[PDB]
Design an enzyme around this catalytic site. Structure first.
Site, PDB file in Angstrom:
ATOM      1  N   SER A  42      29.907  73.694  95.237  1.00 53.64           N
ATOM      2  CA  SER A  42      31.328  73.685  94.854  1.00 53.64           C
ATOM      3  C   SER A  42      31.642  72.649  93.764  1.00 53.64           C
ATOM      4  O   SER A  42      32.322  71.648  94.028  1.00 53.64           O
ATOM      5  CB  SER A  42      32.210  73.399  96.084  1.00 53.64           C
ATOM      6  N   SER A  61      31.178  76.809  89.001  1.00 52.90           N
ATOM      7  CA  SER A  61      30.442  77.182  90.198  1.00 52.90           C
ATOM      8  C   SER A  61      28.987  77.420  89.816  1.00 52.90           C
ATOM      9  O   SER A  61      28.691  77.824  88.690  1.00 52.90           O
ATOM     10  CB  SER A  61      31.041  78.438  90.826  1.00 52.90           C
ATOM     11  N   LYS A  71      25.319  78.421  86.013  1.00 54.48           N
ATOM     12  CA  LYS A  71      26.665  77.864  86.123  1.00 54.48           C
ATOM     13  C   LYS A  71      27.663  78.700  85.331  1.00 54.48           C
ATOM     14  O   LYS A  71      27.405  79.043  84.179  1.00 54.48           O
ATOM     15  CB  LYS A  71      26.683  76.413  85.630  1.00 54.48           C
ATOM     16  N   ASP A 118      23.954  65.354  83.850  1.00 51.82           N
ATOM     17  CA  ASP A 118      25.394  65.003  83.944  1.00 51.82           C
ATOM     18  C   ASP A 118      25.837  63.692  83.274  1.00 51.82           C
ATOM     19  O   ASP A 118      26.169  62.714  83.952  1.00 51.82           O
ATOM     20  CB  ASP A 118      25.866  65.036  85.410  1.00 51.82           C
TER      21      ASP A 118
HETATM   22  C1  LIG Z   1      27.029  71.620  91.152  1.00 54.10           C
HETATM   23  C2  LIG Z   1      26.015  71.092  92.139  1.00 54.10           C
HETATM   24  O1  LIG Z   1      25.887  72.064  93.163  1.00 54.10           O
HETATM   25  C3  LIG Z   1      24.536  72.301  93.329  1.00 54.10           C
HETATM   26  N1  LIG Z   1      24.147  72.407  94.599  1.00 54.10           N
HETATM   27  C4  LIG Z   1      22.848  72.640  94.794  1.00 54.10           C
HETATM   28  N2  LIG Z   1      22.467  72.745  96.145  1.00 54.10           N
HETATM   29  C5  LIG Z   1      21.037  72.811  96.399  1.00 54.10           C
HETATM   30  C6  LIG Z   1      20.529  71.457  96.856  1.00 54.10           C
HETATM   31  C7  LIG Z   1      20.832  70.431  95.815  1.00 54.10           C
HETATM   32  C8  LIG Z   1      21.864  69.541  96.007  1.00 54.10           C
HETATM   33  C9  LIG Z   1      22.154  68.596  95.050  1.00 54.10           C
HETATM   34  C10 LIG Z   1      21.411  68.548  93.892  1.00 54.10           C
HETATM   35  C11 LIG Z   1      20.375  69.437  93.686  1.00 54.10           C
HETATM   36  C12 LIG Z   1      20.092  70.375  94.653  1.00 54.10           C
HETATM   37  C13 LIG Z   1      19.561  69.401  92.441  1.00 54.10           C
HETATM   38  O2  LIG Z   1      19.860  68.238  91.673  1.00 54.10           O
HETATM   39  C14 LIG Z   1      21.242  67.879  91.669  1.00 54.10           C
HETATM   40  C15 LIG Z   1      21.364  66.617  90.853  1.00 54.10           C
HETATM   41  C16 LIG Z   1      22.101  68.918  90.980  1.00 54.10           C
HETATM   42  O3  LIG Z   1      21.753  67.568  92.964  1.00 54.10           O
HETATM   43  C17 LIG Z   1      20.880  73.780  97.534  1.00 54.10           C
HETATM   44  O4  LIG Z   1      21.688  73.874  98.450  1.00 54.10           O
HETATM   45  N3  LIG Z   1      19.748  74.546  97.395  1.00 54.10           N
HETATM   46  C18 LIG Z   1      19.397  75.535  98.382  1.00 54.10           C
HETATM   47  N4  LIG Z   1      21.975  72.762  93.785  1.00 54.10           N
HETATM   48  C19 LIG Z   1      22.476  72.641  92.547  1.00 54.10           C
HETATM   49  N5  LIG Z   1      21.569  72.775  91.477  1.00 54.10           N
HETATM   50  C20 LIG Z   1      20.238  73.041  91.631  1.00 54.10           C
HETATM   51  N6  LIG Z   1      19.580  72.920  90.499  1.00 54.10           N
HETATM   52  C21 LIG Z   1      20.516  72.562  89.564  1.00 54.10           C
HETATM   53  C22 LIG Z   1      20.341  72.308  88.212  1.00 54.10           C
HETATM   54  C23 LIG Z   1      21.465  71.959  87.492  1.00 54.10           C
HETATM   55  C24 LIG Z   1      22.703  71.874  88.102  1.00 54.10           C
HETATM   56  C25 LIG Z   1      23.902  71.496  87.328  1.00 54.10           C
HETATM   57  O5  LIG Z   1      24.753  70.815  87.881  1.00 54.10           O
HETATM   58  N7  LIG Z   1      24.010  71.904  86.013  1.00 54.10           N
HETATM   59  C26 LIG Z   1      24.852  71.093  85.153  1.00 54.10           C
HETATM   60  C27 LIG Z   1      24.652  71.308  83.668  1.00 54.10           C
HETATM   61  C28 LIG Z   1      23.397  72.091  83.359  1.00 54.10           C
HETATM   62  C29 LIG Z   1      23.355  73.309  84.213  1.00 54.10           C
HETATM   63  C30 LIG Z   1      23.013  74.534  83.684  1.00 54.10           C
HETATM   64  C31 LIG Z   1      22.985  75.638  84.504  1.00 54.10           C
HETATM   65  C32 LIG Z   1      23.298  75.525  85.842  1.00 54.10           C
HETATM   66  C33 LIG Z   1      23.645  74.300  86.368  1.00 54.10           C
HETATM   67  C34 LIG Z   1      23.668  73.192  85.549  1.00 54.10           C
HETATM   68  C35 LIG Z   1      22.901  72.121  89.447  1.00 54.10           C
HETATM   69  C36 LIG Z   1      21.767  72.465  90.152  1.00 54.10           C
HETATM   70  N8  LIG Z   1      23.760  72.410  92.248  1.00 54.10           N
END
Ligand SMILES: CCOc1nc(N[C@@H](Cc2ccc3c(c2)COC(C)(C)O3)C(=O)NC)nc(-n2cnc3ccc(C(=O)N4CCCc5ccccc54)cc32)n1
EC number: 2.7.11.24
Length: 342
Positions: free
Chosen positions: A29, A34, A50, A165
């Site tokens: 979230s 998203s 995203k 980020d």
């Molecule tokens: C919004 C966060 O929500 C989120 N939640 C979960 N949940 C995971 C567990 C988890 C939890 C925390 C978490 C990670 C994992 C991995 O590292 C970080 C630091 C993110 O922290 C879970 O449940 N898996 C089952 N994973 C991810 N995520 C996973 N690879 C990601 C790669 C990038 C980003 C991103 O922000 N960008 C930003 C700009 C660049 C870009 C470009 C495209 C898409 C996103 C992006 C998000 C990602 N994002």
């Protein structure tokens, strides 16, 4: 040239992506979009996708979206989150509203690792080395992260790390425990060595298992910091251009720098040395990323031919005062100009 798009609704949000991306599954979230986990059928990679929400709602947000896309289009490094793809379902500029970003799927942040795992000195070496390798790259492009912290660090099972980020600052909150004093208290025009301070805090947390400066507010955190590094000398005081800040500092009882070997008991002496060169109060005297890579603490990972720098990052757009449509048009340009990695 156009791939075929398909539509699906994922928690009250219409996602329109190319056929190559399959099994889209919501994951977090976010506050600027998203994110779904997906499978990219063309590369065979597991990807994060995203959908930027409200990307062109005001001049501010449209510039932010442009900046975001520019940074990510430019970041091409193993330890920095870059862009495997960027797309829009829109066939033209007039119908262009949505930006989707694709990158490598990462398993967890560093928080979810330091909380769950007990870290050997070997793992700390590899993680910190990776952070420093990524920073050398970021700094060589004349970009300061400003907010390095464990939740900005993505790690997977292999311990491969990527940097991410580039009222929320108030209280007993992680959001501030890794900020350099000069950036936290606006002492001066800060430079890129604010990120080195953040690495120092992170490294310490990995070794000890606890937050290094868990201040309950700005003043309490300053006090914790100075308890370890000492109060500013005459030379550093000159450089603090803020008359308000300088006057406050001189009100504090002066303290010497503590002996780090006595604080981080049992640690690798080389880790202790590196920490001392990172957690220097005066930002001018802090070790740089490029210099830190050559520290003997990383002799096992250090590869001078495999620590690359960045291409010129044209950042001159920051000075520009444009209209919504003009930022959006520049964004669209960067979308259609995108060439995937080989
Ligand atoms: C919004 C966060 O929500 C989120 N939640 C979960 N949940 C995971 C567990 C988890 C939890 C925390 C978490 C990670 C994992 C991995 O590292 C970080 C630091 C993110 O922290 C879970 O449940 N898996 C089952 N994973 C991810 N995520 C996973 N690879 C990601 C790669 C990038 C980003 C991103 O922000 N960008 C930003 C700009 C660049 C870009 C470009 C495209 C898409 C996103 C992006 C998000 C990602 N994002």
């Amino acid at each position: 040239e156009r791939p075929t798009f398909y539509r699906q609704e994922l928690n009250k949000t219409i996602w329109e992506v190319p056929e190559r991306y399959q099994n889209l599954s919501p994951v977090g979230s976010g506050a600027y979009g998203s994110v779904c986990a997906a499978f990219d059928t063309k590369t065979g990679l597991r990807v994060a996708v995203k959908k930027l929400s409200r990307p062109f709602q005001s001049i501010i947000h449209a510039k932010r979206t442009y900046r975001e896309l520019r940074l990510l289009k430019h970041m091409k490094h193993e330890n920095v989150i870059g862009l495997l793809d960027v797309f829009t379902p829109a066939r033209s500029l007039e119908e262009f509203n949505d930006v989707y970003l694709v990158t490598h799927l990462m398993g967890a942040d560093l928080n979810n690792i330091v909380k769950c795992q007990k870290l050997t000195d070997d793992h700390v070496q590899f993680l910190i080395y990776q952070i420093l390798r990524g920073l050398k790259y970021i700094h060589s492009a004349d970009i300061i992260h400003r907010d390095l912290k464990p939740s900005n660090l993505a790690v997977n099972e292999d311990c491969e790390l990527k940097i991410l980020d580039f009222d929320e600052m108030t209280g007993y909150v992680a959001t501030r425990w890794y900020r350099a004093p000069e950036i936290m208290l606006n002492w001066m025009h800060y430079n890129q060595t604010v990120d080195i301070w953040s690495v120092g805090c992170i490294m310490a947390e990995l070794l000890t298992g606890r937050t290094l400066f868990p201040g309950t507010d700005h003043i309490d955190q300053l006090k914790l910091i100075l308890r370890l590094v000492g109060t500013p000398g005459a030379e550093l005081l000159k450089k603090i251009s803020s008359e308000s800040a300088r006057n406050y500092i001189q009100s504090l009882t002066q303290m010497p720098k503590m002996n780090f070997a006595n604080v981080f008991i049992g640690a690798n002496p080389l880790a202790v040395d590196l920490l001392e060169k990172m957690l220097v109060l005066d930002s001018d005297k802090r070790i740089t990323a490029a210099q830190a890579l050559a520290h003997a603490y990383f002799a096992q990972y250090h590869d001078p031919d495999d620590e690359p720098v960045a291409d010129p990052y044209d950042q001159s757009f920051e000075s520009r005062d444009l209209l919504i449509d003009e930022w959006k048009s520049l964004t669209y340009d960067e979308v259609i100009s995108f060439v995937p990695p080989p």
